[PDB]
Amino acid sequence: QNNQTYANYSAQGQPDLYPETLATLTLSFPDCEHGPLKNNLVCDSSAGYVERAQALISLFTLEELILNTQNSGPGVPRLGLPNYQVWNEALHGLDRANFATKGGQFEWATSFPMPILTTAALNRTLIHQIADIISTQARAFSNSGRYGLDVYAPNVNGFRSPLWGRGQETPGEDAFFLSSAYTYEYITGIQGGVDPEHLKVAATVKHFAGYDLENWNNQSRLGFDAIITQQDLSEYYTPQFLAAARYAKSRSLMCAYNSVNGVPSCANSFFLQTLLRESWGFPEWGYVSSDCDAVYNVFNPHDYASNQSSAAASSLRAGTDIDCGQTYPWHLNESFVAGEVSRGEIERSVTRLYANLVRLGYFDKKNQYRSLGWKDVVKTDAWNISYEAAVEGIVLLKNDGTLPLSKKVRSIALIGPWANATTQMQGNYYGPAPYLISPLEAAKKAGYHVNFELGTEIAGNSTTGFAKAIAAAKKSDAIIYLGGIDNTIEQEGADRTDIAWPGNQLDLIKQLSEVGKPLVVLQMGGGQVDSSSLKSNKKVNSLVWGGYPGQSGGVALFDILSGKRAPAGRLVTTQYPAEYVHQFPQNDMNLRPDGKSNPGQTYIWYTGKPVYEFGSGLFYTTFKETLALKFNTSSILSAPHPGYTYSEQIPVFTFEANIKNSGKTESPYTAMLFVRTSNAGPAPYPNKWLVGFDRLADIKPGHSSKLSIPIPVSALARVDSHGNRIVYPGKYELALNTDESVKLEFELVGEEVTIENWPLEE
Amino acid sequence: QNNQTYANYSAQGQPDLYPETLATLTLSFPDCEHGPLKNNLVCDSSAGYVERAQALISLFTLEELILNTQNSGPGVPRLGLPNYQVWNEALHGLDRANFATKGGQFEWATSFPMPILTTAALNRTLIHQIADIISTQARAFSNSGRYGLDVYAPNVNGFRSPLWGRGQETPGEDAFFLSSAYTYEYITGIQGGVDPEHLKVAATVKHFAGYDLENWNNQSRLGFDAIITQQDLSEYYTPQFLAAARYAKSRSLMCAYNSVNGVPSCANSFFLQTLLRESWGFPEWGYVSSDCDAVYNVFNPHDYASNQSSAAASSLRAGTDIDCGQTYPWHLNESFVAGEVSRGEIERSVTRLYANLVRLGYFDKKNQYRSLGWKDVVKTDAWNISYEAAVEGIVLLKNDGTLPLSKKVRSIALIGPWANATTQMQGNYYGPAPYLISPLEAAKKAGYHVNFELGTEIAGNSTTGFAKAIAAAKKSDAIIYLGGIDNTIEQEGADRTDIAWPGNQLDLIKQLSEVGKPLVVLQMGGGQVDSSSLKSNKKVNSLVWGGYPGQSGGVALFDILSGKRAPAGRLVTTQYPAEYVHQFPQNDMNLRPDGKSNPGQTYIWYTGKPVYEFGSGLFYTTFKETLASHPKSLKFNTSSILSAPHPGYTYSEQIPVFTFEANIKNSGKTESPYTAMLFVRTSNAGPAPYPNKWLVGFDRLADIKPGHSSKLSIPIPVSALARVDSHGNRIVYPGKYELALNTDESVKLEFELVGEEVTIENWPLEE
Ligand SMILES: *[C@@H]1O[C@H](CO)[C@@H](O[C@@H]2O[C@H](CO)[C@@H](O[C@@H]3O[C@H](CO)[C@@H](O)[C@H](O[C@H]4O[C@H](CO)[C@@H](O)[C@H](O)[C@@H]4O[C@H]4O[C@H](CO)[C@@H](O)[C@H](O)[C@@H]4O)[C@@H]3O)[C@H](O)[C@H]2NC(C)=O)[C@H](O)[C@H]1NC(C)=O
Ligand SMILES: *[C@@H]1O[C@H](CO)[C@@H](O[C@@H]2O[C@H](CO)[C@@H](O[C@@H]3O[C@H](CO)[C@@H](O)[C@H](O[C@H]4O[C@H](CO)[C@@H](O)[C@H](O)[C@@H]4O)[C@@H]3O)[C@H](O)[C@H]2NC(C)=O)[C@H](O)[C@H]1NC(C)=O
Ligand SMILES: *[C@@H]1O[C@H](CO)[C@@H](O[C@@H]2O[C@H](CO)[C@@H](O[C@@H]3O[C@H](CO)[C@@H](O)[C@H](O)[C@@H]3O)[C@H](O)[C@H]2NC(C)=O)[C@H](O)[C@H]1NC(C)=O
Ligand SMILES: *[C@@H]1O[C@H](CO)[C@@H](O[C@@H]2O[C@H](CO)[C@@H](O)[C@H](O)[C@H]2NC(C)=O)[C@H](O)[C@H]1NC(C)=O
Ligand SMILES: *[C@@H]1O[C@H](CO)[C@@H](O[C@@H]2O[C@H](CO)[C@@H](O)[C@H](O)[C@H]2NC(C)=O)[C@H](O)[C@H]1NC(C)=O
Ligand SMILES: *[C@@H]1O[C@H](CO)[C@@H](O[C@@H]2O[C@H](CO)[C@@H](O)[C@H](O)[C@H]2NC(C)=O)[C@H](O)[C@H]1NC(C)=O
Ligand SMILES: *[C@@H]1O[C@H](CO)[C@@H](O[C@@H]2O[C@H](CO)[C@@H](O)[C@H](O)[C@H]2NC(C)=O)[C@H](O)[C@H]1NC(C)=O
Ligand SMILES: *[C@@H]1O[C@H](CO)[C@@H](O[C@@H]2O[C@H](CO)[C@@H](O)[C@H](O)[C@H]2NC(C)=O)[C@H](O)[C@H]1NC(C)=O
Ligand SMILES: O[C@@H]1[C@@H](O)[C@H](S[C@@H]2CO[C@H](O)[C@H](O)[C@H]2O)OC[C@H]1O
Ligand SMILES: O[C@@H]1[C@@H](O)[C@H](S[C@@H]2CO[C@H](O)[C@H](O)[C@H]2O)OC[C@H]1O
Ligand SMILES: *[C@@H]1O[C@H](CO)[C@@H](O)[C@H](O)[C@H]1NC(C)=O
Ligand SMILES: *[C@@H]1O[C@H](CO)[C@@H](O)[C@H](O)[C@H]1NC(C)=O
Ligand SMILES: *[C@@H]1O[C@H](CO)[C@@H](O)[C@H](O)[C@H]1NC(C)=O
Ligand SMILES: *[C@@H]1O[C@H](CO)[C@@H](O)[C@H](O)[C@H]1NC(C)=O
Ligand SMILES: *[C@@H]1O[C@H](CO)[C@@H](O)[C@H](O)[C@H]1NC(C)=O
Ligand SMILES: *[C@@H]1O[C@H](CO)[C@@H](O)[C@H](O)[C@H]1NC(C)=O
Ligand SMILES: *[C@@H]1O[C@H](CO)[C@@H](O)[C@H](O)[C@H]1NC(C)=O
Ligand SMILES: *[C@@H]1O[C@H](CO)[C@@H](O)[C@H](O)[C@H]1NC(C)=O
Ligand SMILES: *[C@@H]1O[C@H](CO)[C@@H](O)[C@H](O)[C@H]1NC(C)=O
Ligand SMILES: *[C@@H]1O[C@H](CO)[C@@H](O)[C@H](O)[C@H]1NC(C)=O
Ligand SMILES: [Zn+2]
Ligand SMILES: [Zn+2]
Ligand SMILES: [Zn+2]
Ligand SMILES: [Zn+2]
Ligand SMILES: [Zn+2]
């Protein structure tokens, strides 16, 4: 929008936003005791939140309303109503806050791992606590005018194509179960419960819908039209958004840049009204924000409207309340002049935003959360849950017992473009951290003699660092290589073009494997890289996926390597063979194989052979898993469901298995539970789908902990050609983990039961 | 549905409901301190109303949920959740209550005038207070297990065709302003404010939409398919429902028997979702009830569904939550089995009902409204607002000085089928009253020597009774004829076939007028009758429309006639000439004239000559009305006016463009209250055809003494000036306009709207 020369937004992965959109404001609170609003109902803390917001909005001029439909809202100075920023980032810690540059206060926020790694821990409580800490820290910054009260998080789009530059931000490729679980735990942690009366921080689930690529084939997200079947819409692209609106009661949602089936998400009333509000129960006075700036893109380049005034009017009427950008505040005045919108439609949007602000305690100084301050940031950071998430999430992919490093290992050769990682560990959308503990520093602090060599860059074709690296290796007890990808390779605005290890890193690892010494390789980054050559190289003793480990990253990794903590992470996306992305266009949105070039996408549908499967992860011990069957769903759904708000949440039954530590190392345990069928519902039939997961606390050798995995009605439902979610009678089989240590056959009997009726598109 | 022999519901005006639907339950409240629910969140009075309702519903079996989608909900005995009745009538007082038959308490409730007469008073405060009394009495009965907490009221369909058997129930023919005003005052009075946290009684605005006939031409409402333009739908058939949902925040709404443009109202997602929820902000956890039993009629006779299971599914999915009938509770089980509905869809609807019950204090014994009792019925009844409404509403149509009856009038010949009226005064949907004061008992109480003769029946065809009535007239100082129509003529389930005085009443009136005595005619009933021959007969000294005056009807009538009170009512429908209904089909839903059979419908569009016009009414005095002041500029810029702050108004379209102000001087012999209707017209603003005029305001002023003046101030809201385009959009158009005060047009004021067109409402596309 703010381009200086011609800009092809069908190709360019990044918009050109106005400085106003991108500005860092200084925030504050209305003075309800002495200010101009003191006798208005909005300042009456005993009144209803809607009635309060309505009373306030009645005081605005038309132009004031319009200006306050943008993310950087100017407020209304004459009313003592301060500017308010809607665009705040919280993906895995505070970002876009007005951080102090000196003074020892508000200089930083806790930098948790990227969600990709945190989700690999398979721990729901963990996700929830991270969210709670983030929203405590948000309130603290807010109380000093340095952060808003709503957050553009979480990013829960399915990591469908492995080359997506933003998959790192997500809880993985399983939109239906794993992502939805993350969605619920994160949003309830941000918001302080399930639609509590006193909202903590408003979540903004994103990006709705069909957004999972930046610019593959030079087709920008900004102009992309996702051709998606109704079946896939219901099955893969929206179930996490149903979870957000229905179960978590997210106060906000962000509509995506792209179109779906010819309709821009932000101008899509089927999306924003029929689905979001009428099918999934999105809060009445919840509000929708556009992406930055998806309203502009309705016009340029989507051409769904002919100018900015019309793009504004179409988005507003479809259900987009707040524009991250300048199209609303600078063109809705034209929309009004042209009769395209009423003042009613504009007031509703602003009223929605302020209704949430009222709920958030914006006008109530005595509100419980208005007293959080810097010491609460200090205290929650000192809990070291960022370290804990990283430690629980790290994935051991290959190991011959070389890990944990034996007491005999005294010197290490520390090699690779991730060996001295600091800011690399933070991924993206991060603010300043209190500290960043590199793998190098953590290695020294662990008490190893460290021979550090860069060896080679992430993406270089230079070998001039090889010799010194081999030299450092030849004079060390073990080699620890840390490499892979980072945000120079995968980023917002630019997808990868391939999913192989970048540069000449694999050559360096090969030459290191032929040194004669034990070799541990840490594959870092969010997306996966093809590590088949490492899998098949016997001289590569150990392979670890370390994701983006956050502020205490080095210590988390080296506590795992040294065996202080025992790894238990599992992959939350498939590591595909490198040729996968060359086999079919990556913006083919069809999940199922087509018998042509599309081989099936994700662990659910892929007919090929993953290098490492979704759900791969090894332990420092061995476990012995043992089991501890005609179900009539219609009957099961006929019963009372105390403890569950929605009927589809009830277990069909609970999978019970004993988990014995048959080895000789204390270890926590993780499990994914999969189901499959070859006769229930329509063909084609999936490989399998995830229906449950859990993490159990450290189990001692000889001890047995019980794994209980409820199998909800919603999880056994399949999706028909119309998008309906229906539980079908037939034969199913559970399988525990990728190793399928335990399997359980059961039959579903009775008639088909409808779980959701998918509505017709407009 | 419960017919014993073949029933043709395309023709038959009344359904055959199962006894279960019609049953009189004994109600009670759950014990939230000690009962099975005490630890459930529903019994936590500090929790959110939605969360409370969700916690309760979670405890139900599927069958218990299904069974509690009917109006006579059985509750859940094992949970200590009592049966609850959704079908409670309150149109003009409590009805379908479990009235006691002995013991001196709860044997009766106040019987107000039918809303048609109440509305004629043009008094907003009156309507609101009536509604407040009704809801106080509702809660009092509720607290003794004798009534529910939601009411199937108000009926606010525009009384469009004059032969409608139920137009009597409505605030008249002006859907946009007059009916919408009644809707607001009544619903907020019923509900105890504007969506208050503590709801007093849930209102159910009805009937949505296109419903304004019972069985004209033997086409029953049960199978009627209204063909209505989007323009008419926005302009005439729905504005009162926008008002109910948006301004009044009605907690419930009732969907109609009929289809509109091929889609039954209760299976109509455009109506129940797109318009109701997305356009007008109907409460998120408000609920929709069908009419009794419109869900059944989706199948039989509409054939929109092939069976009851499919009819239930379609109605539920479209947005109908509660069935007045047994289609839901006895066939949603089948819908579920067939995969047509989810348990989620069923749960939402029951949760919706119980969310309102939570808000109504159904689970909180300490709720403000849970202590109201029989003494509160006695107290509110004794205020005599029923009497007051009738006396305010009575309309003086014709007079030469005969009314009020002079002191010279000692004896009266009281003639007519309405002369000894008791139950006739109650109209329809009435429960037992404390008493009923007939016009006969009232005349005797007031001190006149009364010579009473029936004369003829309402629909009588014999002249045998004439002679005694004529003899009585000859002995008396004045003749007071009371007749017209009643509920043997106009009723639920059966429209009138014509709009003339029934039977030989006019022939009797003619002969009474040949006697040579002063003659006063009281024209009773809700619908109008063609009184043109009474209008032109110089020996009919006076004509009064008395509507259905309720429990103290006789005293209201004779206090007016005696001059103890002075009349100020104005007609709220057009009194058409009898020919009107025989010129064009009465199910032609187009308001505009078409240059063929349709002369235009209502005072807004009618091109013929009313016998008495909408807004007709005379006083016991005369008034001089003069423009008080106008804004310096009479060129109003709507876009600019709407751009300003609007403190004191929730919605921008509610702000005044300006205020019409007049001085009202009593220029006669007698102290009198005053009423005014304010009309606007345009010859160039908006699209053609241009209407006659349309109502934009009204008011009633307190007694004005001879020679004294009072101020009349009538704001002109932006919404009132908006016109409707061919697509249903509400747009304020620039151009020339003229206000006219009353039917006599005593004051007129030209103004101009300048600047661009302004969109007030975008009418959504149908599905
Ligand atoms: C203001 O409010 C007050 C308080 O409510 C009103 O006062 C009440 O007024 C009514 C009506 O006048 C009065 O009820 C009558 O009481 C009489 C003595 O107790 C009764 O004899 C009379 O009974 C007749 O009506 C019954 C209906 O239930 C019939 O069933 C019964 O058969 C009686 O009818 C006989 O008599 C009538 C004429 O008298 C005759 O036509 C019949 O054929 C039959 O022979 C009434 O019940 C109350 O007692 C008053 N209550 C109090 C507390 O004072 C007052 O009316 C209000 N004012 C206005 C203007 O509305
Ligand atoms: C699934 O995730 C949950 C939630 O994160 C996790 O439970 C958590 O475990 C951590 C780690 O033990 C707990 O963190 C501690 O909490 C107390 C507060 O009660 C703090 O005092 C502790 O801080 C000190 O100790 C740290 C570690 O020794 C030091 O680094 C630090 O500087 C402090 O001195 C510490 O933060 C946390 O309390 C729980 N959280 C909850 C909600 O229970 C659980 O273990 C995971 N489950 C499985 C099976 O893995
Ligand atoms: C558990 O939480 C504590 C408290 O936040 C962490 O302690 C902190 O560790 C960092 C990194 O080593 C220290 O920062 C460093 O401090 C030195 C000296 O002041 C400075 O020269 C370095 O540049 C660096 O900033 C920090 O001082 C220390 N803070 C406290 C209060 O002890 C600890 O790291 C956490 N544990 C894990 C495993 O993450
Ligand atoms: C709609 O609003 C925009 C933004 O306020 C207007 O554009 C501004 O016009 C003013 C006055 O001419 C200039 O001084 C500003 O520099 C413009 N601002 C921006 C951000 O472009 C626009 O003119 C308005 N349109 C109408 C019809 O009122
Ligand atoms: C590892 O990275 C750290 C941090 O980026 C490097 O530390 C810097 O070292 C220079 C002196 O050589 C100091 O002046 C800077 O203040 C340090 N930077 C920061 C951000 O603290 C360190 O050199 C790197 N180690 C290597 C390359 O072996
Ligand atoms: C309009 O109706 C109101 C409400 O019923 C009338 O005010 C009532 O008048 C009666 C009889 O004088 C009193 O007993 C009530 O207490 C009054 N009620 C209230 C709420 O004030 C009012 O007189 C009518 N207005 C006009 C102008 O005739
Ligand atoms: C759905 O529910 C209705 C109401 O309970 C069932 O109708 C009853 O069926 C029994 C046995 O068929 C009959 O004896 C009764 O006459 C019916 N009762 C009533 C009140 O009508 C119906 O069977 C159920 N259908 C299904 C498929 O479960
Ligand atoms: C006017 O109507 C009243 C009420 O219906 C009549 O009162 C009834 O008259 C009969 C016979 O006289 C009595 O036995 C009943 O008890 C009365 N019923 C009630 C409810 O009061 C009255 O007779 C009628 N008057 C005339 C003159 O026809
Ligand atoms: O998740 C969304 C992102 O989609 C956008 S991306 C945005 C593009 O425009 C500039 O380059 C911005 O710096 C960049 O963040 O940002 C908002 C997030 O919440
Ligand atoms: O306003 C509605 C009415 O339309 C229905 S009509 C109903 C038809 O079936 C029986 O005869 C009943 O006695 C009659 O009321 O009733 C409910 C009202 O609220
Ligand atoms: C910006 O790019 C658009 C096309 O996206 C083009 O129409 C316009 O001319 C450009 N603006 C400027 C100032 O170059
Ligand atoms: C803009 O980019 C699109 C997609 O990459 C491409 O098809 C088109 O040729 C480009 N248009 C211009 C004018 O360069
Ligand atoms: C995308 O565009 C750039 C030119 O800016 C080009 O270097 C690159 O080869 C293109 N990629 C594809 C797949 O066409
Ligand atoms: C803007 O675009 C709309 C269509 O999206 C069109 O109807 C309107 O006339 C356009 N206005 C101007 C000023 O070009
Ligand atoms: C399943 O349950 C339903 C309802 O409980 C029952 O009607 C049906 O007969 C059962 N069918 C089987 C095969 O168990
Ligand atoms: C009731 O009427 C329907 C048609 O409306 C007819 O099919 C049926 O025979 C009747 N039922 C009975 C029991 O007479
Ligand atoms: C039912 O009534 C309709 C309309 O009055 C008529 O067309 C039809 O012939 C009747 N059907 C039967 C079976 O009598
Ligand atoms: C009921 O009618 C519907 C059509 O509305 C049809 O699809 C369904 O199969 C019918 N069910 C039965 C049991 O006949
Ligand atoms: C009056 O009506 C009755 C019953 O309908 C009938 O027997 C009689 O013939 C009618 N008489 C006249 C004069 O219309
Ligand atoms: C009406 O007001 C609008 C908004 O202030 C302004 O743009 C326009 O010029 C005005 N038009 C007239 C005719 O006064
Ligand atoms: Zn003070
Ligand atoms: Zn102050
Ligand atoms: Zn919590
Ligand atoms: Zn509180
Ligand atoms: Zn513009």
Ligand SMILES: [Zn+2]
């Ligand atoms: Zn008790």
Ligand SMILES: [Zn+2]
């Ligand atoms: Zn009130």
Ligand SMILES: [Zn+2]
């Ligand atoms: Zn309260």
Ligand SMILES: [Zn+2]
């Ligand atoms: Zn049929």
Ligand SMILES: [Zn+2]
């Ligand atoms: Zn039909």
Ligand SMILES: [Zn+2]
């Ligand atoms: Zn059936």
Ligand SMILES: [Zn+2]
């Ligand atoms: Zn005729």
